């Protein structure tokens, strides 16, 4: 999605 | 009447805000020190920290989990700035017309924002928005519900599954409408849900303005370097 940090924080 | 599920929702939203908002503002020490674009390094840090907290609140929201990872990401990316403006109000004070974080160093005023590199075009509507929001004098229950409704909006750019997003929002909206009639007394209650929804439209405009402001700041690399990687990812990318 090109959003690594947001995706990680979300998990 | 307020259904048990509705009460359940409110209780969750309150606790989630409590977990993600520290009224002591003790973490502000960690940020790069405010300098009086002198303010940009400190404010970029405050914004980035705030994005982290908004994410933490967002996970807590009922039904948020059910959304696919892509829909969660688009919702946060679009709404993060608006939530920060909304949440920021607890800090905000009518007396100074400034955001007050328990210390002079951490008290923020229009000239500080300007030092961040923001024009009055963003700032002036921002301060009016803060003023109008304060005037509502919302119950903490209303404040947390409003943040949740802001986040889970179906018309956000990039949303995959709008109907599912709309369904989560409607349950929160219905909880809000029902809460106000049940728990908010006249005359403060009058046209409260409509006034609150008008605040969400104000926020869309602020977000749209912020993006133009970011793009202008963003265009220069040296200014961009001052921002955090989270901030670049959420607003850039
Ligand atoms: C543009 C490149 C830099 C920016 O600072 C963009 C956002 C600016 C314009 C303001 C939006 C909200 C403002 C403030 C918020 C204060 C707090 C946030 C909240 O999460 C919190 C924990 C506290 O209540 C403080 C005041 C400073 C300017 C803004 C960040």
Q: What is the CATH number of the domain that holds B19?
A: 1.10.565.10
CA dihedral (B1, B7, B10, B11) positive or negative: positive
H-type helices in chain B, by residue range? 4-20, 40-60, 69-88, 110-115, 120-136, 140-151, 162-183, 192-219, 221-226, 229-235
**Residue B108 in contact with ligand 1 by CB distance below 6 A:** yes
Residues 6+ apart with CB under 8 A from B139: B179, B183, B184
Closest chain B residue by Cα to residue A9:
B55
**Closest C-alpha among B43, B198, B156, B187 to residue B108:** B43
B62 Ramachandran zone, left/alpha/beta (phi>0; psi -120 to 50): beta
Edge-to-edge strand ranges of the sheet holding B107-108: B92-93, B98-100, B107-108
What six digits make up the tokens of B23? 């009224």
Q: Which domain holds residue B174?
A: 1-237
Is residue B180 exposed (0-12), middle (13-18) or buried (19+ Cβ within 10 Å)?
A: buried
What six digits make up the tokens of B186? 């006249």
Say if CB B186 and CB B57 are below 8 A apart. no
Phi and psi, residue B99, nearest 5°: -85, 120
What six digits make up the tokens of B52? 């982290």
Q: How far apart are CA B133 and CA B196, in angstroms?
A: 8
The ligand 1 atom nearest the CA atom of B25? 22
Find tokens 């039904």 and name the residue.
B63
Q: At what resolution in Å was this solved?
A: 2.1
Total length of chain A:
11
Q: How far apart are CA B148 and CA B57, in angstroms?
A: 8
Q: How far apart are CA B161 and CA B164, in angstroms?
A: 6
Is A8's Cβ below 8 Å from some Cβ in B?
Answer: no
**Residue B152 in contact with ligand 1 by CB distance below 6 A:** no
Is B69's Cβ below 8 Å from some Cβ in A?
Answer: yes
Pocket test for ligand 1, best of B20, B21, B44, B47 (most atoms within 8 A of CB): B47
Q: How far apart are CA B67 and CA B74, in angstroms?
A: 11
**Residue B85 in contact with ligand 1 by CB distance below 6 A:** yes
Count: domains in chain B: 1
Q: How far apart are CA B198 and CA B6, in angstroms?
A: 23
- B187 preceded by a cis bond (ω within 30 of 0): yes
In B94-131, which positions are buried (b, 16+ CB within 10 angstroms) versus exposed (e)?
A: eeeebbbbeeeebbbeeebbebbbbeeebbeebbebbe
What six digits make up the tokens of B100? 């007050």
A-B contacts at Cβ under 8 angstroms: 31
CA dihedral (B38, B40, B41, B47) positive or negative: positive
**Closest C-alpha among B199, B147, B138 to residue B20:** B147
């Amino acid at each position: 999605k090109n959003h690594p940090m947001l995706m990680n924080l979300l998990k | 009447k307020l259904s048990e599920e509705q009460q359940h929702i409110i209780a969750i939203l309150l606790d989630a805000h409590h977990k993600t908002y520290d009224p002591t503002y003790a973490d502000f020490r960690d940020f790069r020190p405010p300098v009086r674009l002198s303010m940009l390094p400190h404010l970029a840090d405050l914004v980035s920290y705030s994005i982290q907290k908004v994410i933490g609140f967002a996970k807590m929201i009922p039904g948020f989990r059910d959304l696919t990872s892509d829909d969660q990401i688009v919702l946060l990316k679009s709404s993060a700035i608006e939530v920060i403006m909304l949440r920021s109000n607890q800090s905000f004070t009518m007396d100074d017309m400034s955001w007050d974080c328990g210390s002079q160093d951490y008290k923020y005023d229009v000239t500080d924002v300007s030092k961040a590199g923001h024009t009055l075009e963003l700032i002036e509507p921002l301060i009016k928005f803060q003023v109008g929001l304060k005037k509502l004098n919302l119950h903490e229950e209303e404040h947390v519900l409003l943040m949740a409704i802001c986040i889970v909006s179906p018309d956000r750019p990039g949303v995959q599954d709008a109907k599912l997003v709309e369904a989560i929002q409607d349950r929160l909206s219905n909880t809000l409408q029902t809460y106000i009639r049940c728990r908010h007394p006249p005359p403060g209650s009058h046209q409260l849900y409509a006034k609150m929804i008008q605040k969400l439209a104000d926020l869309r405009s602020l977000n749209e303005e912020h993006s133009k402001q970011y793009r202008s700041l963003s265009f220069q690399p040296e200014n961009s370097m001052k921002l955090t990687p989270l901030v670049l990812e959420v607003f850039g990318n």
